[PDB]
Amino acid sequence: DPMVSKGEELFTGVVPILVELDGDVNGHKFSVSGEGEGDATYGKLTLKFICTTGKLPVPWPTLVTTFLMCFARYPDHMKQHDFFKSAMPEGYVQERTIFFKDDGNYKTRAEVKFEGDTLVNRIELKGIDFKEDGNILGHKLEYNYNSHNVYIMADKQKNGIKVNFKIRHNIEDGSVQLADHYQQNTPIGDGPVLLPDNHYLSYQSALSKDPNEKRDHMVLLEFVTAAGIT
Question: What result is annotated for mutating residue 171 to L?
Fold first, then answer.
């Protein structure tokens, strides 16, 4: 399939990754820079994020999902369903509303595309209606992350895909902060894309710190694999 060969050609080895996010959550403005590499043959991501404006005013775990579906390992029998690679190199826009249960919301807009050999994710994030002493502004979430599935469907009207999914963040008292994710992706190009049958991505995420790093930061290890089409 020449379409599959094109995206697979861009993704076949280790691809350097750059991430830039501009955020404002209840008027708390902040910037984040991330670097690493993705290796889509194995669905593997290795990233480090740095808050470059001092203290991150929200818990690192709340940003993990905002911070590269093009790096998913699609099994060979599903490669006709990989919308994300198919939109490259021109890229795609990924938009979300994240609803924090009993708290505020993030609205995000990201453009994902190549700049030469570097795979780039430029993000803008706006959070509103957060509670001052709630779990996000209050920094009450544990520095960890559970496994989830992400359900992908075609959105034929937007020449793209819709995604919905729930993340449960661990709260330091043993309870859970539900983050309800609604997502839409659309190509940047006017080029053709692969519109998928219903399927899901399985995510595994592990958070850490760099013991030499004094800035506010997050090391992210992610594995991502498509499934649900036998």
Answer: In R10-3; matures to the red-emitting state with excitation and emission maxima at 555 and 585 nm, respectively
